[PDB]
Amino acid sequence: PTIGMIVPPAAGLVPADGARLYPDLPFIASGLGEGYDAVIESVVDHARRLQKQGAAVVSLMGTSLSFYRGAAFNAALTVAMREATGLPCTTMSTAVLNGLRALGVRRVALATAYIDDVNERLAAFLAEESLVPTGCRSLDTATLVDLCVRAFEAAPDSDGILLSCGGLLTLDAIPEVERRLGVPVVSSSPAGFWDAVRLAGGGAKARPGYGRLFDES
Numbered sequence: 001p002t003i004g005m006i007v008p009p010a011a012g013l014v015p016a017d018g019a020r021l022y023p024d025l026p027f028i029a030s031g032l033g034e035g036y037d038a039v040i041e042s043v044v045d046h047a048r049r050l051q052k053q054g055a056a057v058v059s060l061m062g063t064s065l066s067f068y069r070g071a072a073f074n075a076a077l078t079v080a081m082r083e084a085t086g087l088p089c090t091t092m093s094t095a096v097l098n099g100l101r102a103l104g105v106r107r108v109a110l111a112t113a114y115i116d117d118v119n120e121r122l123a124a125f126l127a128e129e130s131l132v133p134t135g136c137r138s139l140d141t142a143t144l145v146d147l148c149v150r151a152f153e154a155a156p157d158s159d160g161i162l163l164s165c166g167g168l169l170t171l172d173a174i175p176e177v178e179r180r181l182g183v184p185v186v187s188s189s190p191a192g193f194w195d196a197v198r199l200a201g202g203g204a205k206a207r208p209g210y211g212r213l214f215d216e217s
Contacts, residue, residue: 001200002026004055004087005192006046008062008167009033015061017189020171021206021214022197028053032062036069040077047081047089057088059095059196063166063188064114066093068121071128088199092166092188095195097129099186102216105160110136111151113165122164134158139165144173145180152181163187174211184212 005014005027012031030046030053043065047058058081060066066074074093081089100108108131112119115138123133135155137147148161161177163170166188174185194213197204206214 001056001202002028002054003196003200004047004050004053004058005029005061005196006043006050006058007031008065015166015189015193016169017171017193021190021193021210022204023207025197025204028055029061032065036073039065040080043077044080044084047085047087051085051087055087057090057196057200058085059089059192059199060091061166061189061192061196063092063096063122063164063192064118066091067096067125068118070121071125074125090195090199092192092195093125095192096162096164096186096188097126097131098195098198099191099213099216100131100160100162103160103184103186103212105131105158105184105186107132107134107157107159109134109148109151109155109158109161110138111148111161111163112136112138113168114138122162126162141169141172141176144168144170145176148173148177148185149181152183158183160184160186165189166192171210175209178211186213187211190214
Protein backbone atom coordinates (compact mmCIF):
# COMPACT_ATOMS: atom_id res chain seq x y z
CA PRO A 1 0.00 0.00 0.00
CA THR A 2 1.18 3.51 -0.88
CA ILE A 3 1.83 5.69 2.10
CA GLY A 4 1.15 9.41 1.69
CA MET A 5 3.08 11.97 3.70
CA ILE A 6 2.27 15.58 4.25
CA VAL A 7 5.60 17.27 4.60
CA PRO A 8 6.44 20.76 5.84
CA PRO A 9 8.71 21.94 2.90
CA ALA A 10 7.09 23.38 -0.26
CA ALA A 11 9.08 20.74 -2.23
CA GLY A 12 7.10 17.81 -0.91
CA LEU A 13 9.81 15.12 -1.06
CA VAL A 14 9.48 11.77 0.66
CA PRO A 15 11.85 12.39 3.66
CA ALA A 16 15.32 10.90 3.16
CA ASP A 17 14.90 8.28 5.95
CA GLY A 18 12.36 6.41 3.84
CA ALA A 19 14.93 5.39 1.23
CA ARG A 20 17.20 3.94 3.99
CA LEU A 21 14.54 2.33 6.21
CA TYR A 22 11.99 1.09 3.70
CA PRO A 23 13.53 0.82 0.22
CA ASP A 24 10.90 -1.63 -1.02
CA LEU A 25 7.86 0.50 -0.08
CA PRO A 26 5.95 3.06 -2.15
CA PHE A 27 5.75 6.49 -0.50
CA ILE A 28 4.48 9.71 -1.89
CA ALA A 29 4.75 13.26 -0.51
CA SER A 30 2.88 16.48 -0.71
CA GLY A 31 4.56 19.64 0.50
CA LEU A 32 2.73 22.06 2.76
CA GLY A 33 5.13 24.97 2.17
CA GLU A 34 2.08 29.75 12.54
CA GLY A 35 -1.74 30.05 12.61
CA TYR A 36 -4.15 27.26 13.41
CA ASP A 37 -6.83 28.01 10.74
CA ALA A 38 -4.18 28.03 7.99
CA VAL A 39 -2.62 24.83 9.24
CA ILE A 40 -6.01 23.01 9.44
CA GLU A 41 -7.06 23.97 5.94
CA SER A 42 -3.72 23.18 4.12
CA VAL A 43 -3.42 19.92 5.99
CA VAL A 44 -6.93 18.78 4.99
CA ASP A 45 -6.27 20.08 1.38
CA HIS A 46 -3.00 18.13 1.08
CA ALA A 47 -4.47 14.97 2.59
CA ARG A 48 -7.08 15.03 -0.22
CA ARG A 49 -4.23 15.49 -2.74
CA LEU A 50 -2.46 12.33 -1.54
CA GLN A 51 -5.77 10.45 -1.49
CA LYS A 52 -6.15 11.48 -5.13
CA GLN A 53 -2.64 10.26 -5.90
CA GLY A 54 -3.61 6.81 -4.52
CA ALA A 55 -2.34 6.90 -0.89
CA ALA A 56 -3.79 4.13 1.28
CA VAL A 57 -2.99 6.07 4.48
CA VAL A 58 -1.83 9.62 5.21
CA SER A 59 0.69 10.87 7.83
CA LEU A 60 1.22 14.50 8.73
CA MET A 61 4.97 14.25 8.89
CA GLY A 62 5.83 17.31 11.00
CA THR A 63 6.15 16.98 14.78
CA SER A 64 5.95 20.69 15.67
CA LEU A 65 3.02 21.14 13.24
CA SER A 66 1.25 18.38 15.15
CA PHE A 67 2.14 19.06 18.82
CA TYR A 68 2.48 22.83 18.95
CA ARG A 69 -1.20 23.38 19.77
CA GLY A 70 -1.50 20.50 22.21
CA ALA A 71 -2.76 16.90 22.22
CA ALA A 72 -6.47 17.72 21.70
CA PHE A 73 -5.71 19.65 18.48
CA ASN A 74 -3.50 16.75 17.20
CA ALA A 75 -6.42 14.34 17.81
CA ALA A 76 -9.05 16.55 16.18
CA LEU A 77 -6.89 17.39 13.14
CA THR A 78 -6.36 13.66 12.55
CA VAL A 79 -10.12 13.04 12.44
CA ALA A 80 -10.68 15.99 10.07
CA MET A 81 -7.99 14.44 7.75
CA ARG A 82 -9.72 11.09 7.90
CA GLU A 83 -13.20 12.55 7.28
CA ALA A 84 -11.91 14.57 4.26
CA THR A 85 -10.17 11.61 2.82
CA GLY A 86 -11.80 8.31 3.85
CA LEU A 87 -8.33 6.99 4.75
CA PRO A 88 -6.58 6.07 8.04
CA CYS A 89 -4.63 9.16 9.02
CA THR A 90 -1.92 9.90 11.55
CA THR A 91 0.68 12.45 12.53
CA MET A 92 4.36 12.53 13.49
CA SER A 93 3.43 13.48 17.08
CA THR A 94 1.11 10.45 17.30
CA ALA A 95 3.97 8.37 15.76
CA VAL A 96 6.18 9.61 18.60
CA LEU A 97 3.62 8.72 21.31
CA ASN A 98 3.10 5.31 19.70
CA GLY A 99 6.94 4.68 19.54
CA LEU A 100 7.55 5.82 23.10
CA ARG A 101 4.74 3.69 24.35
CA ALA A 102 5.81 0.63 22.29
CA LEU A 103 9.25 0.90 23.90
CA GLY A 104 7.90 1.23 27.48
CA VAL A 105 9.27 4.77 27.77
CA ARG A 106 7.22 6.75 30.31
CA ARG A 107 9.87 9.13 31.68
CA VAL A 108 11.40 10.72 28.64
CA ALA A 109 14.38 13.02 28.11
CA LEU A 110 14.12 15.62 25.34
CA ALA A 111 16.75 16.31 22.63
CA THR A 112 15.51 18.71 20.03
CA ALA A 113 16.30 21.30 17.40
CA TYR A 114 13.63 23.72 18.73
CA ILE A 115 13.50 27.06 20.44
CA ASP A 116 12.56 27.21 24.13
CA ASP A 117 8.93 28.05 23.42
CA VAL A 118 8.51 25.04 21.16
CA ASN A 119 10.27 22.70 23.61
CA GLU A 120 7.86 23.86 26.27
CA ARG A 121 4.91 23.01 23.97
CA LEU A 122 6.50 19.59 23.36
CA ALA A 123 6.86 18.70 27.02
CA ALA A 124 3.29 20.00 27.59
CA PHE A 125 2.01 17.72 24.76
CA LEU A 126 3.74 14.67 26.27
CA ALA A 127 2.44 15.39 29.82
CA GLU A 128 -1.10 15.88 28.45
CA GLU A 129 -0.72 12.30 27.08
CA SER A 130 0.51 11.17 30.57
CA LEU A 131 4.19 10.74 29.76
CA VAL A 132 6.74 12.34 32.10
CA PRO A 133 9.18 14.76 30.42
CA THR A 134 12.48 15.00 32.38
CA GLY A 135 15.53 16.72 30.89
CA CYS A 136 15.59 18.97 27.87
CA ARG A 137 18.60 19.86 25.72
CA SER A 138 18.43 21.48 22.30
CA LEU A 139 20.72 22.42 19.43
CA ASP A 140 25.82 16.09 11.60
CA THR A 141 25.71 12.71 13.45
CA ALA A 142 28.47 13.73 15.86
CA THR A 143 26.48 16.74 17.06
CA LEU A 144 23.18 14.78 17.24
CA VAL A 145 24.81 11.94 19.29
CA ASP A 146 26.33 14.41 21.73
CA LEU A 147 22.97 16.22 21.92
CA CYS A 148 21.21 13.10 23.24
CA VAL A 149 24.01 12.11 25.62
CA ARG A 150 23.83 15.60 27.13
CA ALA A 151 20.00 15.26 27.24
CA PHE A 152 20.30 11.91 29.15
CA GLU A 153 23.15 12.88 31.51
CA ALA A 154 21.09 15.94 32.49
CA ALA A 155 18.41 13.45 33.58
CA PRO A 156 19.70 9.89 34.33
CA ASP A 157 16.30 8.62 35.68
CA SER A 158 14.79 8.63 32.12
CA ASP A 159 13.43 5.45 30.49
CA GLY A 160 14.43 6.78 27.05
CA ILE A 161 15.12 9.77 24.82
CA LEU A 162 12.97 11.69 22.40
CA LEU A 163 15.17 13.08 19.58
CA SER A 164 12.85 15.53 17.95
CA CYS A 165 13.88 16.91 14.57
CA GLY A 166 11.81 15.51 11.61
CA GLY A 167 13.99 17.65 9.34
CA LEU A 168 17.42 16.28 10.44
CA LEU A 169 19.37 13.18 9.41
CA THR A 170 19.26 11.14 12.55
CA LEU A 171 19.43 7.44 11.58
CA ASP A 172 23.18 7.09 12.15
CA ALA A 173 22.94 8.72 15.64
CA ILE A 174 20.13 6.52 17.05
CA PRO A 175 22.02 3.18 17.11
CA GLU A 176 25.21 4.91 18.28
CA VAL A 177 23.28 6.55 21.21
CA GLU A 178 21.42 3.35 22.13
CA ARG A 179 24.74 1.47 21.93
CA ARG A 180 26.42 3.92 24.30
CA LEU A 181 23.63 4.47 26.84
CA GLY A 182 21.57 1.26 26.63
CA VAL A 183 18.37 3.22 26.49
CA PRO A 184 16.01 3.57 23.52
CA VAL A 185 15.80 6.70 21.37
CA VAL A 186 12.58 7.56 19.54
CA SER A 187 13.31 10.03 16.77
CA SER A 188 10.56 12.04 14.94
CA SER A 189 11.24 11.18 11.32
CA PRO A 190 12.08 7.48 11.71
CA ALA A 191 9.17 7.07 14.14
CA GLY A 192 6.80 8.73 11.59
CA PHE A 193 7.90 6.12 9.02
CA TRP A 194 7.62 3.23 11.47
CA ASP A 195 4.10 4.46 12.49
CA ALA A 196 2.90 5.04 8.91
CA VAL A 197 4.14 1.59 7.82
CA ARG A 198 2.32 -0.02 10.76
CA LEU A 199 -0.86 1.93 10.00
CA ALA A 200 -0.82 0.85 6.35
CA GLY A 201 -0.54 -2.77 7.40
CA GLY A 202 0.91 -5.70 5.56
CA GLY A 203 3.68 -6.02 8.06
CA ALA A 204 6.89 -4.90 6.28
CA LYS A 205 10.06 -4.60 8.39
CA ALA A 206 12.73 -1.85 8.25
CA ARG A 207 16.30 -2.58 7.06
CA PRO A 208 18.43 -3.72 10.10
CA GLY A 209 20.60 -1.39 12.18
CA TYR A 210 18.49 1.72 12.89
CA GLY A 211 17.50 1.12 16.54
CA ARG A 212 15.22 -0.61 19.03
CA LEU A 213 12.02 0.97 17.65
CA PHE A 214 12.33 -1.10 14.48
CA ASP A 215 12.16 -4.40 16.39
CA GLU A 216 8.71 -3.26 17.64
CA SER A 217 5.92 -4.58 15.43
